[PDB]
Design a protein around this ligand. Structure first.
Ligand SMILES: CCCCCCCCCCCCCCCCCC(=O)OC[C@H](COP(=O)([O-])OCC(O)COP(=O)([O-])OC[C@@H](COC(=O)CCCCCCCCCCCCCCCCC)OC(=O)CCCCCCCCCCCCCCCCC)OC(=O)CCCCCCCCCCCCCCCCC
Ligand SMILES: CCCCCCCCCCCCCCCCCC(=O)OC[C@H](COP(=O)([O-])OCC(O)COP(=O)([O-])OC[C@@H](COC(=O)CCCCCCCCCCCCCCCCC)OC(=O)CCCCCCCCCCCCCCCCC)OC(=O)CCCCCCCCCCCCCCCCC
Ligand SMILES: CCCCCCCCCCCCCCCCCC(=O)OC[C@H](COP(=O)([O-])OCC(O)COP(=O)([O-])OC[C@@H](COC(=O)CCCCCCCCCCCCCCCCC)OC(=O)CCCCCCCCCCCCCCCCC)OC(=O)CCCCCCCCCCCCCCCCC
Ligand SMILES: CCCCCCCCCCCCCCCCC[C@@H](O)O[C@H](CO[C@H](O)CCCCCCCCCCCCCCC)COP(=O)(O)OCC[N+](C)(C)C
Ligand SMILES: CCCCCCCCCCCCCCCCC[C@@H](O)O[C@H](CO[C@H](O)CCCCCCCCCCCCCCC)COP(=O)(O)OCC[N+](C)(C)C
Ligand SMILES: CCCCCCCC/C=C\CCCCCCCC(=O)OC[C@H](COP(=O)(O)OCCN)OC(=O)CCCCCCC/C=C\CCCCCCCC
Ligand SMILES: CCCCCCCC/C=C\CCCCCCCC(=O)OC[C@H](COP(=O)(O)OCCN)OC(=O)CCCCCCC/C=C\CCCCCCCC
Ligand SMILES: CCCCCCCC/C=C\CCCCCCCC(=O)OC[C@H](COP(=O)(O)OCCN)OC(=O)CCCCCCC/C=C\CCCCCCCC
Ligand SMILES: CCCCCCCC/C=C\CCCCCCCC(=O)O[C@H](COC(=O)CCCCCCC/C=C/CCCCCCCC)COP(=O)(O)OCCN
Lengths: 56, 121, 104, 329, 53, 459, 64, 175, 54
């Protein structure tokens, strides 16, 4: 029954929601370490006409 | 370090005026979130001690706990950031003003450095 | 469901404690002989003969036929040595010294 | 093209099918022993063809199909050697196992767990196949330990009997004593010739030192029941008669002699190890024959006969005639 | 998960190392170069301390 | 890595807000999902590492241990599901909370790119273990075992804090990358000798080394099934893992400072293997077996050769799985027997055949049978030690023989023979126990197909 | 139960340090360690001396 | 097959004799080969042709990654962490490539040994010489570095070897 | 099993520590509560610190 199983099965979304939250946190933490993007002495590459960043 | 006797210090000021020249911590700072979590834990423990429904006894009390913890955490973070900024500023100024005690190291290349080799056998 | 007195204790010097220990282990008083009071911690555990467990009466109606044991007797300190799966001391048709001499 | 490799792999593959089917429905009926016997007979008839092609041409080949892993400069791959020794010993073992299984279909008709018995026999046959056709020392060790475990499981077939468990543990003990020397030889070969493969081992060791050959001889003595570690073979007669007829009579007990045969290019280059193995073979064959001269249990007499024959083929290895030892096997 | 681990993309660069070794060996065999060089780094860039003892 | 840490944290609110009759289902399902997600760390590269952030980094050494740690928890829940039937809801939720906290602390410990954070979580993983041992234990000796486990670890680990802080003050950083890149040789002096001892003893006490192993039998015997499994599977690998990480700074001192520990381990493996032969207990026997294997791992780590490191990693993973399975089997026997004595119940193969084949497979794996990863690690370690010195083969072979002897003794005494007559409560095995042991054993026979995933960074 | 208790948990409370027990403990717990240390130290010293002299023929010793 | 290069995996021309039946007895080998071909090779060949023609309808490519050269550890500052990192990664890649080179030589040696049969001691002198040279070079390069090997340790070993050989050469010249 | 693992290894590290700490605790905590002895010890330590650390 809708709105009744929710009162008993609302806890099953906790881990998936936390997993998505952790993926978002990992991406956000990665966004702060872009101090050498496309500047490494080995992977230095000229940008394509329609790329702004080498990696996200 | 002992910055107690640092010149030009107001005896009983939590945040000096120059501390306003630094970026304030964001309201979504992880440390502020930790203060909020500590407040929620305090509320849950209070509910448990008084023998009340732990998760849903007093919502206003838990909200007040969280808000007070967040407030104190924000101001404490501001003071901590100001103090660390002061430490770094004094360090850099003293290094600049005493070049004799901090000489520039003669940069060297691994090609002309002899390090002993200890084989593993 | 075992009282503290049933557990083994220190080496008994007085004959009264010796008799009490012998009664505890379900054996006769003058048939009970503990290990000598040396440094090792045998305590008041009876020194049963070094007789193995393969040469017990194989036709007797034991409670544990494979181990050749009866429910409740004192158990040899080295039972895991003599379980018919390991060292046994069955008498041999030829003497031990002569066997060693011949093989060497 | 060149059906030699295809058929030589196919015999070992078809030998595995009943093991896969052991969880199917046919395992729960009385049709399983006939199924296993027919599978073994078909495998023998299929393996008879590479023998004919080798006889006609002189065919030799090694197959390295699956590359297991590389450790820096060493490669371990599932490589089979299909030389004269393997291509000739496969049909004999398959024929003997076929006859033994047909005999067991009559000897063990009253055993409730007969299907499990046939499955164990097939597992032993598969492991011996692995040991015989192995090309690198690691696969040889896999077969070496598998045959030992199968012998342990089949000796103690009757779990109620205490003597069966005692004999199984004794056989495991002596086989581990042999495995000590086997592991020593494996470690020496890897650390000096930088390869567990037989090809690189044969090239890189023109004058093989004493230690690896000593380890190989110790392992062969352990598994072939020589004088130092003989009693496990006579005491392994606590198992069912077919097990003693197949495992501890003619196939499994010749694994050490086969190991010494396989490393014959290195045995020739050393004179001390040849002397030691000749002496070991002579003393063990005389001792086991003398013990058998007065025995009263028939299976004991045949076991000591097997031990004497193994000593004789070890002597044959001692006088530098490995091929004659293979023929005697 | 077993299938995922089995088909894991080769990030360890096992095939890449094999291809590079193949190219290096072919080039050094074609021109007569002595395969592996006993010196990992060229002596010219390396500077030694003169003992004069 | 937060995609692993956050769901493990969220496991707590799920457990606390679940229904009174559905905690086990939710915990098991979501722990299995977490393990599936954590399986992705196995894709390491031949270059440095998977540097996620400034705080967490993953190597090809941390990945197998992390996967094993994430995989263990569902098995712990399945093993603990039986003896907690007559327990109140709050205490069951507290038990699951302790298990989740232990998993989270181990997960944060294994990556821990900074050594001080590694030490903090390494010591933090102790409190839930001590609570589990001393609270949910049957025997009256659980208090003594808990005290021994606390103090043996803490006395060894306390000098490590001073050593690490001193290393930070002199070197300037305790980040593992900087430590590895800026490593310098250690001069042979008394101060360096004592710094070596402080940095080594804290990990050598946990594996443990022979002579400091007195806490392991007590902790393993008196703990519940979940505590025994986590102790024998993951908590022992903390020392070994720590040693590999911290060994780099020490050279070249180790070359001569490893002699006492090498002798102690190469003799203690023989001593404990011999001890396993004459034992009146099952869990104690398995604990001594774990001690022997960890002594072998100690020798491998102290040798400091590539093959030694690969063999060490393989042995850690294999022994963790094998000992967890053995403790599971012992607990299953003890629940029906209620005695925990090897010779009290005999001939169980007649009554429980599937349990018998599980026993056989576990004993074969413990026996280091090829081509299982147990023998892969064993053989790699033996070859490395032979390269170190040709005489180690004697000790290694004797250890192998005694290991086979006591493993088959354990199998035979409890499985073969005539059944005990005065026991009539041997109920048929449930589906839970069979599933638990199947899930214990199948990963081993799957990993033997792809050993490169568990061979460490020096592969 | 009595046998198991006497074998496992009743050994230390009945232990006394005497010439015999002390000598047996010292020997059986110290002698093997120093014996093996001396043996391995001698072997490794000989091996390192041979390596320093260069007369060992360490060819093809790639994996270690 | 063109899957592997022939120059890096050399193979002799593999000359084979001709059938010269001395008797009129029909050898079972030829009959067995014919029946095996007819009832085995044909279905396998047809299945493979079907699979290959299925592949040809959907064709796509994958490329081999090329790595730029970066300054070695020899031209690296004392504490420049970035250049040290780049040089260390380059050294690790070179180590892997050299390991695969040794693997190539070992594979060729084993193939030579098994192919030549009973005269392997004579016909495979060249492969043994190549393996000896490559093994000596590899041992001089990366042997005895230790479990925690690094570019700095290899450079130090090279420096020590060069010191020893320079001293030996000076002693020989001044003798 | 018995002589080394269960007797001497226990005697050396854990049991010796337990005995030593028990004896020292018994020594330290056994004060009759009399302030006469307390103040005599105070005078003794005052004299010791005055004449030693200067
Ligand atoms: C990290 C920790 C975090 C939390 C810290 C503390 C907070 C809560 C503690 C208060 C205690 C409450 C309690 O007792 O539990 C009962 C209560 C349920 O039972 P109840 O019927 O309501 O009340 C019964 C009475 O409380 C009492 O029931 P009883 O009297 O009938 O039962 C008796 C029982 C009751 O005794 C207890 O329950 C003990 C209480 C716990 C101790 C609190 C310690 C304070 C913090 C220390 C944490 C240490 C961490 C460091 C690691 C070392 C570990 C020691 O006592 C015993 O069993 C005797 C022996 C005790 C066993 C051994 C003791 C070990 C204690 C160590 C605990 C450490 C881990 C704490 C984790 C959380 C535990 C609640 O539990 C709860 O409901 C609260 C749990 C949390 C609520 C979460 C809800 C929010 C989630 C939804 C939103 C999602 C969030 C994310 C949003 C974003 C998503 C998109
Ligand atoms: C030989 C290869 C066979 C391949 C065919 C496919 C087989 C796949 C099996 C996968 C693993 C088995 C699952 C483990 C639990 C068993 C399930 C169970 O409860 O049984 C009830 C079930 C029904 O019986 P039931 O009447 O209802 O229950 C009554 C009781 O259970 C009464 O039970 P019982 O009296 O029937 O005895 C239980 C039985 C079965 O239980 C077990 O013991 C199974 C565990 C054996 C492994 C021992 C540990 C050593 C580590 C081995 C690592 C290899 C794994 C490779 C990948 C495996 C993938 C999972 O134990 C044995 O048969 C003795 C095993 C000792 C064999 C020693 C030889 C080991 C090395 C051989 C070479 C392997 C690599 C070859 C490389 C070169 C060749 C290309 O029976 C079976 O399922 C029997 C299965 C066949 C046995 C396989 C044992 C050897 C094969 C190992 C893996 C194959 C490698 C790939 C080769 C392909 C070519
Ligand atoms: C790390 C991996 C594993 C290793 C760890 C495990 C192994 C290492 C640790 C454990 C072994 C270390 C033990 C050595 C010292 C422990 C002795 C002790 O604690 O004294 C307690 C214990 C307390 O004394 P007590 O209770 O007043 O007298 C009881 C006896 O009835 C009274 O005895 P008595 O008056 O009839 O005769 C005593 C006398 C007679 O000496 C003898 O009977 C034979 C000679 C023994 C020493 C000369 C060689 O001994 C001497 O005068 C020799 C002085 C030098 O003293 C003894 O019983 C031992 C005295 C004999 C010394 C033996 C030390 C030699 C061992 C090598 C060093
Ligand atoms: C009941 C009687 C039997 C019935 C069953 C009949 C069927 C028989 C089959 C049983 C075994 C037969 C052997 C056949 C093996 C073929 C598959 C094998 O070749 O694949 C392996 C691959 O398998 C996986 O690698 C092994 C599984 C991974 C192990 C992870 C365990 C799962 C996670 C659970 C928790 C982990 C706990 C421990 C953490 C460390 C090897 O991979 P590789 O040869 O290179 O190449 C793969 C293809 N490439 C080239 C594209 C890459
Ligand atoms: C009990 C369970 C096991 C626990 C762990 C045991 C392992 C810890 C043991 C420590 C290992 C050895 C410690 C010191 C090794 C250095 C070598 C030294 O011992 O030998 C001679 C040293 O001479 C003497 O040994 C001096 C030390 C004597 C005092 C130390 C106590 C010796 C016995 C006590 C051992 C107790 C260990 C357990 C404590 C509870 C060499 O003389 P020298 O070449 O000039 O000095 C070399 C060092 N230099 C280069 C820095 C100068
Ligand atoms: C090397 C040292 C070997 C030390 C062996 C340690 C064994 C300790 C525990 C073993 C388990 C005990 C056990 O199983 O019981 C003994 C069991 C029962 O005896 P049964 O005769 O079968 O009784 C049948 C009538 N009822 O028998 C055994 O297993 C005895 C096994 C011990 C063998 C020890 C002798 C080994 C000597 C090796 C020397 C030869 C070296 C090789 C020579 C060749 C060199 C080129
Ligand atoms: C079966 C049902 C399906 C039948 C149709 C398919 C028939 C075969 C066609 C498949 C194509 C061939 C194939 O499988 O790919 C090869 C593939 C591996 O790919 P590679 O690149 O060559 O090596 C791994 C490194 N990349 O090989 C295989 O996995 C299949 C054959 C492997 C052997 C079979 C397994 C038996 C051994 C089990 C493991 C035993 C333990 C290890 C042994 C120790 C050896 C020292
Ligand atoms: C300088 C001083 C160094 C201080 C080092 C402190 C070591 C930490 C352990 C101290 C424990 C001492 C307490 C003690 O043993 O009391 C005796 C106590 C009596 O029992 P109670 O429960 O107190 O009374 C109940 C009956 N009325 O005896 C026991 O039962 C002992 C049980 C726990 C034993 C734990 C010992 C573990 C120590 C491991 C070795 C590490 C030592 C640390 C130093 C290392 C050496 C450099
Ligand atoms: C299961 C229980 C095991 C207990 C293990 C406890 C022993 C651990 C080893 C000793 C730990 C203490 C060492 C201190 C930490 C190292 C820090 C350091 O390196 O600083 C040194 C200082 O070294 C020290 O101060 C060490 C003093 C030792 C005091 C504590 C002694 C502990 C017991 C000693 C014997 C134990 C050795 C064997 C233990 C075996 C296990 C029982 C450098 O001195 P500098 O001032 O920088 O000099 C430079 C200018 N020349």
């Amino acid at each position: 029954n809708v709105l009744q199983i929710v009162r008993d099965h609302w806890v099953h979304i906790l881990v998936p929601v936390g997993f998505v939250f952790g993926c978002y946190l990992d991406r956000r933490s990665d966004e702060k370490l872009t101090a050498f993007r496309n500047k490494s002495l080995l992977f230095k590459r000229e940008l394509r006409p329609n790329e702004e960043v080498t990696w996200k | 370090t002992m910055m107690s006797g640092r010149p030009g210090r107001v005896p009983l000021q939590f945040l000096p005026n120059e501390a306003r020249s630094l970026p304030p911590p964001k309201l979504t700072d992880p440390r502020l979130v930790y203060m909020g979590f500590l407040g929620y834990c305090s509320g849950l423990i209070d509910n448990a001690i008084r023998r009340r429904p732990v998760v849903s006894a007093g919502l206003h009390r838990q909200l007040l706990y969280v808000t007070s913890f967040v407030f104190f955490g924000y101001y404490l973070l501001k003071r901590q950031d100001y103090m660390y900024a002061l430490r770094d500023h004094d360090m850099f100024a003293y290094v600049k003003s005493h070049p004799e005690d901090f000489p520039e190291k003669d940069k060297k290349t691994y090609g002309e450095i002899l390090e002993e080799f200890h084989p593993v056998r | 469901h075992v009282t503290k007195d049933m557990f083994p204790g220190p080496y008994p010097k007085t004959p009264e404690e010796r008799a009490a220990a012998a009664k505890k282990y379900n054996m006769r008083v003058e048939d009970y002989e503990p290990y000598p009071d040396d440094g090792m911690g045998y305590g008041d555990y009876p020194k049963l003969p070094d007789r193995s467990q393969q040469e017990r009466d194989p036709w007797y109606d034991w409670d544990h036929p494979d181990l050749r044991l009866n429910w409740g007797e004192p158990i040899h300190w080295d039972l895991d040595m003599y379980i018919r799966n390991r060292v046994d001391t069955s008498p041999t048709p030829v003497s031990w010294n002569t066997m060693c001499k011949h093989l060497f | 093209m060149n059906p030699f490799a295809s058929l030589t792999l196919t015999t070992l593959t078809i030998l595995t099918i009943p093991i896969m089917m052991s969880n199917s429905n046919i395992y729960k009926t009385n049709l399983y022993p006939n199924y296993v016997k027919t599978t073994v007979s078909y495998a023998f008839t299929l393996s008879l063809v590479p023998l004919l092609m080798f006889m006609h041409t002189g065919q030799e080949m090694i197959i390295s199909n699956w590359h297991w892993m590389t450790l820096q400069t060493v490669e371990l791959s599932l490589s089979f050697k299909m030389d004269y020794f393997s291509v000739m010993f496969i049909p004999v073992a398959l024929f003997v196992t076929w006859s033994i299984m047909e005999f067991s279909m009559w000897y063990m008709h009253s055993d409730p767990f007969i299907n499990r018995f046939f499955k164990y026999l097939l597992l032993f046959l598969i492991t011996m196949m692995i040991l015989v056709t192995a090309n690198n020392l690691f696969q040889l060790f896999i077969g070496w330990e598998g045959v030992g475990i199968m012998s342990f499981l089949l000796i103690g077939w009757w779990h109620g009997r205490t003597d069966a468990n005692t004999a199984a543990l004794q056989a495991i003990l002596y086989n581990r004593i042999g495995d000590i020397g086997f592991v020593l030889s494996m470690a020496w070969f890897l650390t000096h010739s930088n390869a567990w493969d037989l090809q690189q081992i044969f090239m890189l060791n023109n004058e093989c030192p004493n230690m690896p050959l000593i380890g190989l001889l110790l392992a062969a003595a352990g598994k072939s029941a020589q004088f130092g570690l003989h009693p496990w073979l006579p005491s392994a007669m606590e198992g069912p008669t077919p097990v003693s007829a197949l495992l501890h009579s003619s196939t499994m007990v010749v694994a050490g002699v086969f190991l010494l045969i396989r490393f014959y290019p290195l045995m020739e280059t050393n004179k001390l190890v040849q002397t030691m193995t000749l002496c070991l073979g002579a003393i063990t064959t005389l001792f086991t024959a003398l013990c058998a001269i007065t025995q009263n249990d028939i299976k004991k007499i045949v076991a000591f006969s097997t031990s004497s024959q193994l000593g004789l083929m070890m002597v044959t290895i001692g006088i530098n005639q490995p091929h004659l030892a293979f023929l005697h096997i | 998960g077993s299938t995922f681990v089995a088909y894991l993309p080769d990030y360890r660069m096992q095939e890449w190392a094999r291809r590079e070794a193949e190219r290096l060996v072919k080039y050094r065999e074609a021109n007569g170069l002595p395969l592996m060089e006993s010196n990992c780094f060229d002596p010219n860039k390396i500077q030694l301390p003169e003992d004069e003892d | 890595m937060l995609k692993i840490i956050i769901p493990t944290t969220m496991l707590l609110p799920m457990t606390w807000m679940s229904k009174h009759n559905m905690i086990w289902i939710n915990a098991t399902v979501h722990s299995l999902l977490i393990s599936l997600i954590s399986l992705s760390l196995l894709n390491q590269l031949g270059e440095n590492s998977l540097n996620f952030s400034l705080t967490f980094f993953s190597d090809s050494l941390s990945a197998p241990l992390l996967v094993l740690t994430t995989w263990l928890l569902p098995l712990m829940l399945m093993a603990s599901q039986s003896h907690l039937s007559k327990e109140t809801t709050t205490r069951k939720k507290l038990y699951i909370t302790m298990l989740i906290l232990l998993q989270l602390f181990l997960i944060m410990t294994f990556t821990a790119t900074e050594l001080i954070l590694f030490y903090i979580l390494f010591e933090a993983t102790l409190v839930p273990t001590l609570i589990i041992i001393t609270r949910w234990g049957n025997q009256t000796e659980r208090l003594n075992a808990g005290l021994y486990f606390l103090f043996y670890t803490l006395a060894g680990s306390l000098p490590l804090l001073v050593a690490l802080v001193y290393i930070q003050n002199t070197t300037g950083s305790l980040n593992f990358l900087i430590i590895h890149y800026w490593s310098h040789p250690l001069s042979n002096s008394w101060s360096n000798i004592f710094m070596w001892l402080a940095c080594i003893m804290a990990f050598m006490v946990k594996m443990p080394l022979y002579g400091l192993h007195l806490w392991l039998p007590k902790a393993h015997v008196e703990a519940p099934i979940a505590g025994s499994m986590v102790l024998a599977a993951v908590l022992l690998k903390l020392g070994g893992y720590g040693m590999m990480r911290i060994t780099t700074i020490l050279n070249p001192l180790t070359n001569y400072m490893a002699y006492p520990f090498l002798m102690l381990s190469m003799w203690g493996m023989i001593m404990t293997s011999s001890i396993c032969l004459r034992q009146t207990d099952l869990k104690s026997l398995i604990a001594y077996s774990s001690v022997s294997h960890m002594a072998l791992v100690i020798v491998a780590i102290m040798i400091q050769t590539p093959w030694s490191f690969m063999g060490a990693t393989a042995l850690m993973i294999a022994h963790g799985l094998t000992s967890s399975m053995l403790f599971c089997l012992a607990n299953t026997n003890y629940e029906r027997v209620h005695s925990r004595t090897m010779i009290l119940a005999r001939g169980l193969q007649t009554l429980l055949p599937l349990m018998a084949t599980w026993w056989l497979v576990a004993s074969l794996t413990n026996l280091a049978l090829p081509p299982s990863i147990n023998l892969i690690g064993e053989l790699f370690i033996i070859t490395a030690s032979f390269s170190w010195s040709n005489i180690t083969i004697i000790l290694m072979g004797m250890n192998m023989m005694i290991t086979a002897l006591y493993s088959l003794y354990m199998l035979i005494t409890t499985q073969r023979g005539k059944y005990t007559h005065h026991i009539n409560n041997i109920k048929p095995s449930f589906t839970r126990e069979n599933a638990l042991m199947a899930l214990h054993i199948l990963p081993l026979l799957l990993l033997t197909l792809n050993p490169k995933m568990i061979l460490g960074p020096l592969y | 139960i009595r046998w198991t208790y006497a074998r496992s948990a009743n050994i230390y409370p009945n232990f006394r340090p005497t010439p015999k027990t002390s000598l047996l403990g010292a020997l059986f717990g110290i002698g093997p360690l120093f014996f093996w240390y001396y043996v391995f130290k001698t072997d490794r010293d000989k091996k390192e001396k041979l390596i320093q002299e260069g007369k060992l023929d360490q060819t093809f010793n790639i994996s270690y | 097959p063109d899957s592997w290069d022939k120059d890096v995996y050399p193979e002799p021309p593999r000359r084979t004799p001709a059938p010269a039946p001395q008797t009129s007895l029909p050898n079972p080998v030829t009959y067995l080969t014919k029946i095996f071909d007819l009832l085995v090779d044909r279905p396998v060949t047809l299945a493979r042709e079907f699979i290959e023609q299925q592949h040809a309808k959907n064709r796509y490519y994958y490329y081999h990654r090329e790595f730029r050269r970066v300054p070695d550890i020899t031209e690296c500052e004392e504490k420049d962490i970035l250049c040290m990192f780049e040089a260390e990664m380059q050294w690790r890649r070179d180590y892997k490539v050299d390991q695969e080179i040794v693997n190539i030589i070992q594979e060729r040696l084993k193939a030579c040994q098994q192919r030549e049969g009973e005269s392997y001691r004579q016909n495979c002198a060249k492969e043994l010489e190549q393996f000896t040279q490559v093994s000596k070079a590899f041992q001089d390069r990366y042997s005895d570095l230790g479990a925690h090997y690094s570019a700095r340790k290899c450079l130090a070993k090279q420096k020590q070897r060069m010191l020893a050989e320079r001293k030996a050469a000076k002693e020989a010249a001044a003798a | 099993s018995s002589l080394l693992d269960l007797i001497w290894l226990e005697t050396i590290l854990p049991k010796t520590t337990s005995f030593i700490q028990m004896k020292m605790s018994i020594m330290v905590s056994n004060q009759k509560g009399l302030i006469k002895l307390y103040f005599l010890s105070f005078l003794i330590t005052i004299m010791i610190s005055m004449t030693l650390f200067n």
